Amino acid sequence: TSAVQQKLAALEKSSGGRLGVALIDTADNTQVLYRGDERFPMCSTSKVMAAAAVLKQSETQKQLLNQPVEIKPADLVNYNPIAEKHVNGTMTLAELSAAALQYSDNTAMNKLIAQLGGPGGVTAFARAIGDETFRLDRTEPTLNTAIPGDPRDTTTPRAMAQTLRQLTLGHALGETQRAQLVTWLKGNTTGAASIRAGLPTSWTVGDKTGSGDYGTTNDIAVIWPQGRAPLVLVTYFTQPQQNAESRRDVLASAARIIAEGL
Numbered sequence: 001t002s003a004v005q006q007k008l009a010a011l012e013k014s015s016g017g018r019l020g021v022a023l024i025d026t027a028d029n030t031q032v033l034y035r036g037d038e039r040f041p042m043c044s045t046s047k048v049m050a051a052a053a054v055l056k057q058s059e060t061q062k063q064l065l066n067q068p069v070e071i072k073p074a075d076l077v078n079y080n081p082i083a084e085k086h087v088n089g090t091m092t093l094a095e096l097s098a099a100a101l102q103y104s105d106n107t108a109m110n111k112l113i114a115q116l117g118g119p120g121g122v123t124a125f126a127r128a129i130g131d132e133t134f135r136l137d138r139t140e141p142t143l144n145t146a147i148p149g150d151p152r153d154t155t156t157p158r159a160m161a162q163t164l165r166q167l168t169l170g171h172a173l174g175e176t177q178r179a180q181l182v183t184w185l186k187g188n189t190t191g192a193a194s195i196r197a198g199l200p201t202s203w204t205v206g207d208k209t210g211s212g213d214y215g216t217t218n219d220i221a222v223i224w225p226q227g228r229a230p231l232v233l234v235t236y237f238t239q240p241q242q243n244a245e246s247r248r249d250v251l252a253s254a255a256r257i258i259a260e261g262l
């Protein structure tokens, strides 16, 4: 047990919930884990895997990202900030990917899932890039039920950090697709209260947040600190009662402990 792990345990104890952290420092490939092999509900952090799977398909189909997808009134779910503007119209797969990642649009996520053939097509892409842990079992919005002990729609911090590294800094995607994913993550609108809030302001972050039942509050990030190689950091948090409040501050606190330990 490291000093960082003891601080994360103290943060977790004060929070009342269950915290999972995985850091990869690409300067030396070392890792810091807290509950790194426990499962957590992904909520909207799963949008990264779905967008990446579509990017992989686009490597052999130069026009795929320009393909229009119909949006019907019945397609709207519980949070559709972009898709609702296009009801009875279309959005391209690029527009759906950008809306899912940067606004957390759940209708857009469902269109990405459908393009991949269903939740299992997202899982299949995960397996193809070496992630044996990720599983997507449901569409939006039911993938956010976040029931303690339920394996559906979960991963572990260790697995998600490794996958996020391979997708954004490694070679799981082609070069232009990796750059597109990084551009999308860096343009996220939803992240300033989460990992980013615990890191030095001069550092550059791309991230995807998640929120669900059981007060589940998540963030997965690639970080370009000032003066050193990039980091990958995932922070997952879930709570004992179904109606628990969101706790983005806990993720900021975990990120700050990680940063102070570098």
Ligand SMILES: O=c1c2c3c(sc2ncn1Cc1nnn[nH]1)CCCC3
Residues within 6 Å of the ligand: none
């Ligand atoms: O007992 C508490 C408590 C209590 C709290 S917080 C706390 N923290 C540590 N500890 C010490 C401990 N030893 N074994 N498990 N926990 C609220 C009221 C009940 C007792």
Ligand SMILES: O=c1c2c3c(sc2ncn1Cc1nnn[nH]1)CCCC3
Residues within 6 Å of the ligand: 078, 079, 141
């Ligand atoms: O969807 C939400 C949301 C949303 C919120 S809070 C919330 N809580 C539970 N749920 C899940 C739910 N509870 N009952 N039916 N579904 C704000 C953005 C839009 C979606």
Ligand SMILES: O=c1c2c3c(sc2ncn1Cc1nnn[nH]1)CCCC3
Residues within 6 Å of the ligand: 044, 045, 079, 103, 104, 190, 209, 210, 211, 212, 213, 246
């Ligand atoms: O914010 C929520 C929420 C919230 C809920 S559910 C939900 N679903 C999506 N979204 C949008 C989202 N952004 N990043 N991941 N998901 C309960 C209270 C706190 C906010």
